Structure 1
Amino acid sequence: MKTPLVTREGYEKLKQELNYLWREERPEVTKKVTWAASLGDRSENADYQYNKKRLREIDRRVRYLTKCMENLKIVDYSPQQEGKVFFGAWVEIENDDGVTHRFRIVGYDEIFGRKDYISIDSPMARALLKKEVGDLAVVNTPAGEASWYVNAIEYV
């Protein structure tokens, strides 16, 4: 349920974050918690407490990111082996009443609505994983029963 593969692009980000976190926001957060204490009482002060949390949360991701950088795996792959869906592949799919929605498959670690918003350890990513330019893919979930048609695969 935890997958190491990560795009080259996505890698740059993870690095970027740890950078922004340790060099740019840790300074900001620690600085406020400072004044907070100088300013007064611990409980009634909401900013002393809020900032303590964001700093606990901040150093937390700092920890996670750091380890995922070393254990993550990059998938530098271009158009040569194409046709089949597997990774970093922008896929288009169809619904009978007309539901059309795009998506490229990339890892959960760093996915946001920015580059591609589908993780590989995901149902759709599983069904659609390796299927030709026009197969009939299925997906199941609690109330979710679903049929989809693979339209086009674009790797760029």
Structure 2
Amino acid sequence: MKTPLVTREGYEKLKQELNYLWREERPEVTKKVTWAASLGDRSENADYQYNKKRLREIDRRVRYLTKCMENLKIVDYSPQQEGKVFFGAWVEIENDDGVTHRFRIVGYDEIFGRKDYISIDSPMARALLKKEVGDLAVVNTPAGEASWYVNAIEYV
């Protein structure tokens, strides 16, 4: 239900968000809640409510990313071992209907429209794990099974 594999750039970005929050946004909201609580001190005061709620959320996320920075394992490998599509690969797949579909595969904690937004613990990935330029990949979605053809493998 989890895999600590990480890409270097994503790890960099994680450190980046970590610093951005615990160094810039937390102190801003800090000053904010302080001035808001300059003896306002009202439970009903939904300003204080929402502010502390932003606090709760940012704290949950910082603890999450903290435990991540702890456990997460980086593999920033070269394009050296190629052919196999084990991980970190720009890949295109096609359908009977010709559904072109391109993406690079990265770690769970990198799923955003930023660079490349396909998991590794995903079923698609599990199929894509070890195949070659011309294999017949198959999966079993909760809607049933399906298949695709490999069309591209690229590294960086």
TM-score (norm 1): 0.92
Partner Cα distance (1:86, 1:111) in 2: 18
State the partner residue of 2:130. 130
Residue 10 (structure 2) aligns with: 10
- 1:6-58 Cα shifts (integer Å, max 9, x gaps): 00111101111110111001011122222333384735543321121111111
Kindly provide the CA deviation profile for residues 50-84 of structure 1, in whole angstroms up to 9, marking residues without a partner as x.
12111111112111212211211111211111111
Alpha carbons of structure 1 residues 47 and 101: separation in structure 2 relative to 1, 3 Å: farther
Alpha-carbon distance between aligned partners in 2 of 1:62 and 1:146, rounded to the nearest angstrom? 39
Q: Which range is displaced more, 65-74 or 18-27?
A: 65-74
- How far off its partner does 1:142 sit? 1.7
Q: Percent identity?
A: 100
In structure 1, stretches of 5+ residues that fail to align are none
Q: 1:149 to 1:39 in 2, by over 3 A?
A: farther
Q: Distance in 1 between matches of 2:115 and 2:77?
A: 16
Q: How many correspondences in the alignment?
A: 156
SS at 1:50 equivalent = helix
Aligned position for 1:88: 88
SS of equivalent residue, structure 1 residue 38: coil
Of 86-95 and 23-32, deviating more is 23-32
Query: What RMSD in Å do the two structures reach over aligned CA positions?
Result: 1.6
1:107 touches 1:120 (CA, 8 Å); kept in 2? yes
Residues 1:47 and 1:90: Cα distance change in structure 2 (over 3 Å): same
- How many angstroms apart in 1 are the aligned matches of 2:42 and 2:128? 53
Structure 2 gap ranges (5+): none
Q: Which residue of structure 2 lines up, in the alignment, with residue 31 of structure 1?
A: 31
Three-state SS of the structure 1 residue aligned to 2:37 is: helix
Following superposition, the deviation at residue 89 of structure 1 comes to: 0.3
Q: Aligned partners of 1:63 and 1:41: how far apart in 2?
A: 27
Q: Is the 8 A contact 2:110 2:117 kept in 1?
A: no
CA distance in 2, matches of 1:42, 1:119: 44
